[PDB]
Structure formats: C-alpha cells, structure tokens
Design a protein around this ligand. Structure first.
Ligand code: R13
Length: 137
C-alpha cells in the first residue's frame, strides 16, 4: 500500500470534457490539455501522510495532507477548496472537495493503486469523469 514514487502517465481520457463542464473557454482549455498530457508526478508517503507534486510546463501543484484531516488545495480550474481524503479501501483514497467561496460543480478525486502496479487517478465534475493512469518511471 505504498504510493511513493515518480510516476509518468500512460493514459488519459475525458480531461478536456472535464474542463468544458467547468466553464473554461476553448483557448485556455487547449493550453491546459496540451501541457497536462505530459505530467511529472512525485509522491512521498509515510503512513497517512502524503506529499504529491504534479508538474507541467504551465503549472505545478504541491499538496501535503494527512488522510482523515481536512486541508486546503485548489480545484482543477484553480479555485480554492477544502478537501478531506479517506481510505475507501486498502489501496484507494477518495477526496471530497468543497469550495471556500461561491458555487460550482461538485468536484472530487480518487487515487488507487491497482494490483498490476499502476496508479489510477480519477477527477470528477458533476457527472463528468476524467480517468488518468500512471506507472512508475
Ligand atoms: C497534470 C494534471 C492537471 C493539469 C492541469 C493543468 C496543466 C491546467 C488546468 C487548468 C488551467 C491551466 C492548466 C492553465 C495554466 C492553462 C490556466 C487555465 C486553467 C483552466 C486554470 C493532473 C494530473 O494528472 O494529476
């Protein structure tokens, strides 16, 4: 049950559709979609403590959190939110997000370590689901 490692993406689907439901104009979606197809992901895990750095040419995010403890991060479209991660199963964590200001689509994410050694990340916005699959570099 160790997510630690440097991960590279091998499959991504419905990412643009995700941004579309968030109301991002076409020009910006193009820039985001292009850069998001080549992320560099670093994860450091110790017990329930996580450090996840996701880097792209146009944006880098770093989150630090303890499963079960509320923290603050940003939605995919850059809006400040309060998040809470819980273990849904032994190798699957689910995160429920809550906007700090205003309204918007219900968003969340999940990260799961599969039995073949891969990592599946799913990001949701209302009914749209983006699936991203990684493998260690
Ligand atoms: C890599 C990844 C996600 C990458 C997302 C990127 C780059 C992204 C997302 C949204 C945006 C931008 C970039 C830029 C900066 C163009 C500004 C416009 C908005 C609409 C605010 C997820 C993962 O795989 O964990």
């Amino acid at each position: 049950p160790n997510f630690s490692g440097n991960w590279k993406i091998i499959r991504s689907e419905n990412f643009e559709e995700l941004l579309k439901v968030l109301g991002v104009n076409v020009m910006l979606r193009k820039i985001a979609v292009a850069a998001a197809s080549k992320p560099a992901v670093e994860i450091k895990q110790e017990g329930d403590t996580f450090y996840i750095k996701t880097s792209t040419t146009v944006r880098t995010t770093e989150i630090n959190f303890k499963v079960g403890e509320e923290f603050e991060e940003q939605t995919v479209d850059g809006r400040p939110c309060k998040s809470l991660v819980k273990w849904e199963s032994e190798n699957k964590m689910v995160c429920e997000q809550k906007l700090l200001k205003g309204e918007g689509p219900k968003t969340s994410w999940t990260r799961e370590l599969t039995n073949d050694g891969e990592l599946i990340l799913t990001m949701t916005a209302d009914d749209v689901v983006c699936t991203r699959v990684y493998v260690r570099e």
